[PDB]
């Protein structure tokens, strides 16, 4: 039947946005509700949920306006449609920062963590403790003799030093020290069981302490090491502050303790980077949605601008979303090259945040951007194509599932809260 087909597609579309709206409001309430879920990764998700929540609000407002000059001729409809088109562009640009974040998350490691904390030295320097240092935190000997320190470094580099050591030689010696740090942990009875239980992010935090202090030095933190192995991060965070290490070097310790408490790299992230993501997700859509809205009002104003078939005014809202999808597929392909490399080299386990986040992001990129790339320059079997209405309505539900309800961290918070109710 023709009327029955048009009515049935309306139901799966409206229940699609009803299930997506409720799931995204519940999902966003979970990420805001639990304090341990307050990290840059989940804040990026909250802006992405907000763009799908406002899109749903436009769909429910358009439908509510059907009940009582027709609505197609009104100015209110054109605004609801302009706001809807702003939400669609935000969905794809918050999906771009979602990919851009993931890619930088795969790029940050212990070597980049220590290069920030230890810094770089070109020439030999006698530090406050009496130890001669050079490169990226490479301590030589406490022996007060620059002549013998240069000779001690000469055997540890290959050729004659003179004093100045190049950027490549320092990185060569840096890989040695980081390899010497991990061999020490695994060669220690009190550090191997806690390191093997820690995730890749909290492992780098343990290596960082060993790099500065030493294998036998950090092994003394018997009180902190046990509550780390027992996954009690918040209890270990306040206990590590009550240390000699925290009062000696406080700016470095606060960063390492945050990485143990959260299991993220946020204490090494710059505050302007997140301000650049909000400028992409909510800023860039405004730069092409409002010129589209102005040209449609002045040169193609006919039935809430639904008659979008006359000039280049279609391309100004379809070329920027194609650009966000082409770059999202370039990230998609490159992220897969990095993830399969880190898994094969045993640099990553599938239980780590970078893999599980990749497992959801790499799903949503071809889920939202494949249609846009395939039918890239098509302006305008009718029942079979009307199945696009089912996926654009349930989009929000899928985002809420893959970035919240199947997330392992949120499931920890529900069980941790339920256990506190009993105890
Ligand atoms: C809609 C579906 C049927 C498809 C979805 C499914 N997609 C998926 C599954 C696996 C790989 N994959 C494996 N290896 C590689 C490689 F090659 F190494 F990159 C990629 N890629 C894509 C999925 C399943 C599980 C999760 C998941 O638990 N999320 C929670 C993690 C989090 O948010 O913190 C997410 C997505 C489910
Ligand atoms: C308990 C809450 C239940 C109510 C249901 C929620 C309704 C959904 C709408 C908006 C919230 C999502 C948008 C706000 C989150 C983004 C915050 C932000 O802009 O920046 C990140 C952070 O604040 C910098 O550190
Ligand atoms: C039945 C088991 C159900 C759920 C656990 C599996 C959930 C994880 C889903 C990922 C499955 C997958 O497709 O990844 C394997 C990949 O091919 C290789 O890296
Ligand atoms: C319209 C529904 C209301 C939704 C809230 C508005 C969104 C602004 C974000 C803040 C949510 C308020 C909950 C507090 C969590 C923030 C944590 C904090 O920094 O204190």
Q: What are the angstrom distances between the C-alpha of 328 and each of 9, 177, 231, 388, 400?
A: 30, 37, 35, 21, 20
98, 117, 118, 215: the active-site residue: 118
Q: Are residues 248 and 309 in the same domain?
A: no
Ligand 2: atom nearest CA of 28 is 6
Find the angle CA(178)-CA(180)-CA(183) to the nearest 5 degrees: 110
Residues 6+ positions from 250 with CB-CB distance below 8 Å: none
8 A C-beta contact, residue 282 and residue 90: yes
Q: What are the angstrom distances between the C-alpha of 327 and each of 85, 172, 278, 321, 347?
A: 20, 34, 18, 10, 26
Cα–Cα distance between 69 and 333 in angstroms, integer? 51
Q: Are residues 401 and 371 in the same domain?
A: yes
8 A C-beta contact, residue 256 and residue 209: yes
Q: What are the angstrom distances between the C-alpha of 139 and each of 135, 149, 179?
A: 9, 10, 15
Phi-psi sector, 139: left (phi>0), alpha (psi -120 to 50), beta:
beta
Burial of 227 (0-12, 13-18, 19+ CB in 10 A): middle
Rounded to the nearest whole angstrom, what is the distance from the C-alpha of residue 47 to the centroid of ligand 2? 7
Rounded to the nearest whole angstrom, what is the distance from the C-alpha of residue 45 to the centroid of ligand 2? 9
Question: Strand 121-126 vs strand 132-135: parallel, antiparallel, or unpaired?
Answer: antiparallel
63, 127, 154, 302: the active-site residue: 127
Q: H/E element holding 357?
A: helix 353-374
Burial of 248 (0-12, 13-18, 19+ CB in 10 A): exposed
Count up the domains in the chain and report the number. Answer: 2
Q: Are residues 238 and 339 in the same domain?
A: no
> Which residue from 403, 302, 410 is spatially nearest to 358, judged by alpha carbons?
403
Among 230, 251, 268, the domain boundary falls at 268
DSSP class of 267: G
Q: Tokens representing 249?
A: 């070097």
Cited resolution, angstroms: 2.7
Q: H/E element holding 124?
A: strand 121-126
Ligand 2 contact, 28 CB (< 6 A)? yes
Strand partners, 133: 125, 139
Burial of 332 (0-12, 13-18, 19+ CB in 10 A): buried
Q: Whose CA is nearest to atom 2 of ligand 2?
A: 29
8 A C-beta contact, residue 300 and residue 308: yes
* Domain that residue 351 falls in: 2-106+270-422
Among 237, 268, 299, the domain boundary falls at 268
Cα–Cα distance between 213 and 140 in angstroms, integer? 14
8 A C-beta contact, residue 93 and residue 51: no
Q: Residue 139: phi, psi to the nearest 5?
A: -75, 135
> Which residue from 22, 83, 25 is spatially nearest to 55, judged by alpha carbons?
83
Q: H/E element holding 139?
A: strand 138-139
Q: Are residues 412 and 315 in the same domain?
A: yes
Cα–Cα distance between 158 and 173 in angstroms, integer? 11
**Determination technique for this PDB entry?**
X-ray
**Does 372 qualify as catalytic in the annotation?**
no
Cα–Cα distance between 114 and 135 in angstroms, integer? 12
Find out whether 139 is annotated in a ligand binding site.
Answer: yes
Q: Name residue, tokens 């985002």.
A: 399
Cα–Cα distance between 12 and 389 in angstroms, integer? 8
Find out whether 239 is annotated in a ligand binding site.
Answer: yes
């Amino acid at each position: 039947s023709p009327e029955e087909q048009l009515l049935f597609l309306y139901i799966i579309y409206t229940v699609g946005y009803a299930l997506s709206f409720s799931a995204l409001v519940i999902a966003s309430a979970i990420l805001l509700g639990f304090r341990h879920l307050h990290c840059t990764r989940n804040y990026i998700h909250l802006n992405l949920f907000a763009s799908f929540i406002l899109r749903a609000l436009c769909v429910f407002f358009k439908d509510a306006a059907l009940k009582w000059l027709s609505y197609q001729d009104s100015l209110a409809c054109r605004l609801v449609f302009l706001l809807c088109q702003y939400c669609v562009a935000a969905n794809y640009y918050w999906l771009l920062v979602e990919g851009v974040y993931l890619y930088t998350l795969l790029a940050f490691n212990i070597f980049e963590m220590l290069r920030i904390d230890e810094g770089l030295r070109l020439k030999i320097y006698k530090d406050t403790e009496g130890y001669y240092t050079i490169g990226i935190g490479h301590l030589l000997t406490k022996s007060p003799s620059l002549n013998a320190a240069k000779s001690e470094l000469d055997k540890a580099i290959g050729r004659n030093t003179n004093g100045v050591i190049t950027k490549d030689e320092a990185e060569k010696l840096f890989n040695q020290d980081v390899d010497a740090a991990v061999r020490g942990i695994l060669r220690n009875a009190k550090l191997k069981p806690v390191y093997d239980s820690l995730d890749a992010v909290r492992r780098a935090a343990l290596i960082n302490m060993v790099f500065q202090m030493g294998e036998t030095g950090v092994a003394g933190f018997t009180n902190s090491l046990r509550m780390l192995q027992q996954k009690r991060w918040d209890e270990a965070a306040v206990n590590l502050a009550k240390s000699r290490w925290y009062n000696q070097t406080p700016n470095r310790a606060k960063r390492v303790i945050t990485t143990f408490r959260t299991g993220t790299w946020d204490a090494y992230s710059e505050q302007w980077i997140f301000r650049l993501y909000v400028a992409i997700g909510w800023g860039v859509p405004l730069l092409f949605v409002v010129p589209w809205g102005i040209v449609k009002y002045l040169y193609e104003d006919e039935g809430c601008w639904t008659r979008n078939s006359n000039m280049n005014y279609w391309l100004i809202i379809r070329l920027p979303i194609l650009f966000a999808c082409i770059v999202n597929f370039l990230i998609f392909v490159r992220v897969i090259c990095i993830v399969v490399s880190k898994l094969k080299a045993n640099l990553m386990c599938k239980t780590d945040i970078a893999f599980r986040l990749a497992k959801s992001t790499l799903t949503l990129i071809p889920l939202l951007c494949t249609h846009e790339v395939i039918f890239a320059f098509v302006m305008d079997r009718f029942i079979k194509l009307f199945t696009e209405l089912s996926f654009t309505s349930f989009q929000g539900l899928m985002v809420a599932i893959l970035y919240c309800f199947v997330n392992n961290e949120v499931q920890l918070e529900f069980r941790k809260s339920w256990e506190r109710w009993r105890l």
